[PDB]
Each structure stands twice: as C-alpha cells, then as structure tokens.
Amino acid sequence: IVGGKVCPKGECPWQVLLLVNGAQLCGGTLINTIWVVSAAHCFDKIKNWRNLIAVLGEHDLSEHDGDEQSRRVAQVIIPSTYVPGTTNHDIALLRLHQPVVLTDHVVPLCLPERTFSERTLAFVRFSLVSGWGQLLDRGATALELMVLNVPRLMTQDCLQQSRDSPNITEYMFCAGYSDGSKDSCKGDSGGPHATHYRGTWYLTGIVSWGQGCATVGHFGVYTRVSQYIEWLQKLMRSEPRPGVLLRAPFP
Amino acid sequence: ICVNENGGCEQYCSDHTGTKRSCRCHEGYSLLADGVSCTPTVEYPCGKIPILEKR
Numbered sequence: 305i306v307g308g309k310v311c312p313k314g315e316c317p318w319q320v321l322l323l324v325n326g327a328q329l330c331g332g333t334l335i336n337t338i339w340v341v342s343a344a345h346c347f348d349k350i351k352n353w354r355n356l357i358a359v360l361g362e363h364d365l366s367e368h369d370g371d372e373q374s375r376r377v378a379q380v381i382i383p384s385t386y387v388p389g390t391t392n393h394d395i396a397l398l399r400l401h402q403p404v405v406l407t408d409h410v411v412p413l414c415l416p417e418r419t420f421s422e423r424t425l426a427f428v429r430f431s432l433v434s435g436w437g438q439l440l441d442r443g444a445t446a447l448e449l450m451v452l453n454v455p456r457l458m459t460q461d462c463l464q465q466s467r468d469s470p471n472i473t474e475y476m477f478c479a480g481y482s483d484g485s486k487d488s489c490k491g492d493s494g495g496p497h498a499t500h501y502r503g504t505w506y507l508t509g510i511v512s513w514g515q516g517c518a519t520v521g522h523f524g525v526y527t528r529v530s531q532y533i534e535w536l537q538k539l540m541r542s543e544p545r546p547g548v549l550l551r552a553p554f555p
Numbered sequence: 556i557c558v559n560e561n562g563g564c565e566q567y568c569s570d571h572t573g574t575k576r577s578c579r580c581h582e583g584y585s586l587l588a589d590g591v592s593c594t595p596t597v598e599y600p601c602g603k604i605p606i607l608e609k610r
C-alpha cells in the first residue's frame with residue numbers, strides 16, 4: 305500500500321495473508337470460517353500446491369503475538385474464463401482445510417447480495433484497501449498491515465482521466481488517485497476493497513492490477529466482486545473435490 | 556422500492572408484486588420489528604469490528 309497508514313491491530317480482522325513455503329504471496333479476505341476470496345493471478349506460478357498457507361489475525365510480520373491463526377489451503381477455485389498471465393476474471397475462492405476460530409482479531413467480511421452491491425454499494429464513494437505490500441513502487445514490503453481509503457470511479461471517467469495497456473472490462477472497476485501519491489501495490493494483490501454501509505462492511509473489490517504502483521495519471525484496478533456473487537455462493541454450497549486447484553465454469 | 560435508497564433497508568431488499576417490499580439480513584443477523592434494521596444474533600457477525608464495537 306502506497307501513502308496509507310498502519311491499520312490499528314484488529315481493525316482489518318478479515319484481512320488474510322497468503323504464504324507459499326513461508327514466503328509472502330498475496331492477500332485475501334475471509335468471508336466466513338472456511339472461505340477466503342483472493343485474486344486468481346496470485347496462483348499463476350504455484351507448483352508447491354501443498355505448501356499454501358492462509359494466516360488470519362495477522363498484524364506485524366516480525367512477531368508472533370498469539371492472535372495469528374494458520375490454515376492449510378485445501379482448494380483454490382478459479383473461474384474457467386480466467387486466463388493465466390492476464391487481468392480479466394481475477395478472482396479465486398479458497399477453501400481452508402479446517403475452519404478458523406472467530407475472535408476479536410479474526411472476523412469475516414460480509415459477501416453482499418448482487419442487487420444490494422450493484423444498486424447501493426457501487427455508489428459509496430470511498431472504500432478501504434489493505435495489505436502488507438510495497439510501501440513504494442520498486443520499494444520494500446510493509447512489516448505491519450497497511451490500509452488506504454480510495455474513491456471509486458465510473459469506468460468512463462477512469463478511461464477519460466487516465467494517460468499495450470489492458471482494457472477495463474465489466475468484471476473490473478477503477479479506484480484511487482491519479483496524482484501518484486496513493487495506491488495499492490504488487491504484494492497487496494488479492495486483498496480486500498471493503499465498503500462501509502449503515503454500520504457494516506462489505507466485500508466490493510479485490511486488489512487486482514495497475515501500471516506500476518501510484519503511477520501519475522493511473523488508478524488501481526479492482527475485480528468487481530458483484531459479478532461473481534452467484535458463482536461464489538454456488539461453490540460454497542458444493543462438496544470439496546480431490547486436487548487443490550479447481551477450475552469452475554463461469555457464469 | 557429497492558432501487559431508491561435501498562428501499563429503506565439497512566442490508567438487503569427484495570421487491571414484491573405491488574408496492575410491497577421485504578428487507579432481509581446477512582446470516583448472523585435478524586431483522587427488527589421496524590422491518591428495516593438488522594441486529595447481530597452472534598458474537599462475531601460479519602463486517603463488524605469487535606475492538607471498535609466494544610468501545
């Protein structure tokens with residue numbers, strides 16, 4: 305996260321940290337005790353599928369304080385329409401091997417209904433993005449969880465206000481600033497874009513892509529979660545299948 | 556009714572045949588007798604921050 309602040313410990317309790325062989329991979333969002341939403345591009349280079357770990361209740365990476373909960377990732381579900389190395393349909397649904405225990409430090413974010421998300425949440429201006437990503441473009445990653453408030457743009461405005469570049473599809477939305485001061489970054493990928501509405505927080509986006517980090521004339525691009533609500537809900541109501549990676553038809 | 560200011564619902568809104576509207580809540584919440592407000596039914600409802608709630 306570029307130009308944000310430290311998220312006070314326990315204030316982003318749905319934030320997930322994803323690890324591969326103990327190394328920082330991506331972020332994610334806890335949506336109930338066994339399911340995590342992340343970005344499909346996080347898994348393009350995984351070979352060690354058995355060494356994928358999700359950490360909940362994480363805050364400071366240099367110290368174990370006892371609030372952290374680690375779980376092996378039993379399944380990674382990607383839409384059939386996602387193509388590795390590309391940006392469209394950038395979403396993954398992760399099943400944890402065992403549920404996490406809900407505590408003051410581990411709480412899921414509400415996965416909203418599609419209609420509520422499209423006709424109400426999509427109009428809330430500002431939302432929070434968070435992660436342990438780079439504090440700067442070509443800079444070191446954060447030791448403490450960072451959070452940033454970003455405003456959402458209509459796609460027409462994003463394309464007009466912006467300077468080989470990928471297109472902005474109906475499965476994405478733009479959010480942030482074009483002055484090069486504030487943005488999400490590389491290592492924040494998969495993390496939540498969370499929207500507050502009448503005392504409750506909801507999942508509206510997933511940190512997906514951008515041209516560098518906080519590049520002048522460019523905004524962050526987020527997966528438009530509202531397009532995937534039914535796809536996510538049907539998968540969560542289904543029985544697990546052998547093998548970690550699963551490609552599931554979309555729509 | 557649901558398209559305009561979320562039909563007055565705190566959370567989810569369903570339109571029905573006529574001028575009829577039903578508000579609904581996410582799991583771990585119950586709808587109050589006002590028919591619009593959602594109250595937590597569990598210790599850790601989704602999208603609420605316990606350290607801020609217990610302050």
Ligand SMILES: O=C(O)c1cc2cc(Cl)ccc2[nH]1
Nearest residue numbers: 488490512513514516524525
């Ligand atoms: O990998 C990167 O360079 C990268 C990923 C990413 C995601 C957002 Cl939302 C904004 C900027 C970003 N840069």
Ligand SMILES: [Ca+2]
Nearest residue numbers: 364365367368
């Ligand atoms: Ca720690």
